[PDB]
Amino acid sequence: GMPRDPEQRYEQCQQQCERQRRGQEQTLCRRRCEQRRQQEERERQ
Numbered sequence: 001g002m003p004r005d006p007e008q009r010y011e012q013c014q015q016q017c018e019r020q021r022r023g024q025e026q027t028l029c030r031r032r033c034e035q036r037r038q039q040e041e042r043e044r045q
Contacts, residue, residue, distance in 0.1 A: 013033030018025060018034065 010030070010033070013029055014025070016036075017029035017032045021028065
């Protein structure tokens with residue numbers, strides 16, 4: 001796919017998902033950060 005380990009990307013995800021809401025961050029952060037990525041890809045350019 002691309003260079004750089006998934007963990008570093010998740011670290012960035014942790015900062016953004018944490019800001020929007022706190023609690024049960026493990027499942028919530030992974031889903032919220034990842035779903036944003038899907039939206040970003042569909043967003044033109």
